[PDB]
């Protein structure tokens, strides 16, 4: 007795099939993202708790942030297919909300180079097909999910983390309800 359906969970009635086994939705325009990102850490905690052999996956969503929303999509399918996703995540959320220097297309590849891809590769990586194909990859999770917001989190499929079941006067006991909660589940 301590993770419950429909208090620290909900179970979707559309499950997805060959879903990730955890699989996270965010926007780098998303105050509560950057909530989660730079001050809970959610997703350490996350991958610190997880079973051997469950993988956590993110996602970037659009429906935030206009044309930089989709300019930044891409630009994590880059860091998705480069595997730099955790050199660029603190640079792109405070290159967005917090110094607001992140305005342009240009502005993003200027945080891989100075995180250490050179320019070609990035750009090489920008016009693939696989950045491409990871692009509608993401866009296809969100739409099998029926994504309404960020941030989000679904594991196998079937649970959506209920983070408004949980008790947020404590930040630390919030962001370990939230790992147990994604542990307990990763299991069911």
């Given amino acids: 007795a301590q993770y419950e359906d429909g208090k620290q969970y909900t179970t ?10 955890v699989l996270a ?21 996350v991958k610190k708790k997880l079973p051997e052999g ?17 300019d930044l999509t891409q ?5 998705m297919a480069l595997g730099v996703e955790d050199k660029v995540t603190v640079p792109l959320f405070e290159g967005v909300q917090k110094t607001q220097t992140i ?18 590769e990035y750009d090489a990586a920008w016009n693939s097909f696989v950045v491409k194909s990871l692009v509608a990859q993401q866009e296809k999770a969100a739409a099998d999910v029926q994504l309404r917001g960020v941030p989000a989190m679904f594991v196998n499929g079937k649970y959506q983390l209920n983070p408004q ?10 962001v370990q309800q939230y790992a147990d909660t994604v542990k307990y589940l990763s299991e069911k």
Wanted: with cysteine; aromatic share 14%.
């Fill in 12 to 21: 979707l009635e559309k499950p997805v099939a060959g879903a990730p086994q």
């Fill in 25 to 45: 939705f965010f926007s780098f325009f998303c105050p509560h993202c950057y909530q989660f990102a730079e001050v809970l850490h959610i997703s350490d905690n």
């Fill in 54 to 70: 469950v993988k956590m996956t993110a996602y970037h969503v659009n429906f935030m942030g206009g044309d930089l929303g989709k």
């Fill in 75 to 79: 630009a994590w399918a880059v860091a």
């Fill in 103 to 120: 305005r342009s297309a240009s502005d993003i590849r200027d945080v891989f180079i100075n995180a250490g891809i050179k320019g070609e």
């Fill in 165 to 174: 079941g949980m008790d947020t006067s404590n930040m630390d006991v919030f």
